[PDB]
Structures are given as structure tokens and as C-alpha cells.
Amino acid sequence: VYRELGSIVQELKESGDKLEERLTMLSDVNLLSASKPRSNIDSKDLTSHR
Amino acid sequence: QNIQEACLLLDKKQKHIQILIKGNSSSKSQIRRSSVEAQKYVQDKLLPWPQE
């Protein structure tokens, strides 16, 4: 009984960890919709600087 | 000779009796220990799982 409950807890834990990882990824600011273009030209935008 | 042999036999039997007495006393203590081990396993290892 102890081995069986142990397996169920592990499966739930692995699923829980994977979910947290995905949520963290989806909350990345660069992925989030059309923030109003930045008013300042990004240092990485070489064309606008030129 | 028979009487002597018989006396030896009685002595052997007597020894066995003394062994069984000890044996049964030990078994009784063991049964108490074994009972305490199973209860301790349920309390320490199984009862905490529902919370996890």
C-alpha cells in the first residue's frame, strides 16, 4: 500500500512541476500581447539608429 | 541399566521442558514487539500520505 501511494504522489508531483514550468514560460513579458510599441528605440534596433 | 537409562531420559526430557518454557516466554515478548512494529509502521509511514 505504501509503494502504490508513493507512485501516485510522484505522478501528481511530476505533473505539478511541469505545469509550473509551462506557466512560467507563458508569463514571459516578450510573449505577452502587443504591448504598445515602446516610445524609445531599442539598442538592438540597429536600423532605426542608423 | 534400565533405571539409569531411564533417569537420563527423564533428564533429557527435563531439559526440553526447560527450553520450551524459555522458548514460550520469549515468543510472548516477541509477539508484543511484533505488534508494536506493525503499529509503528502504520503511524510513521502510511498515515502521513493523505496530506501529501
Smallest Cα distance from B49 to chain A, Å? 7
- Nearest chain A residue to B41, by CA: A2
Find cell 501516485 and name the residue.
A8
Size of interface A-B (CB pairs under 8 A): 9
For chain B, count helices (H), then strands (E).
1, 0
Cβ of residue A41 closer than 8 Å to a chain B Cβ: no
- Tell me, rounded to whole angstroms, the distance of Cα A2 from its chain centroid: 35
- Residue B27 burial (CB count, 10 A): 11
Structure determination method: cryo-EM
Cα A3 to Cα A9: distance, rounded to the nearest angstrom: 10
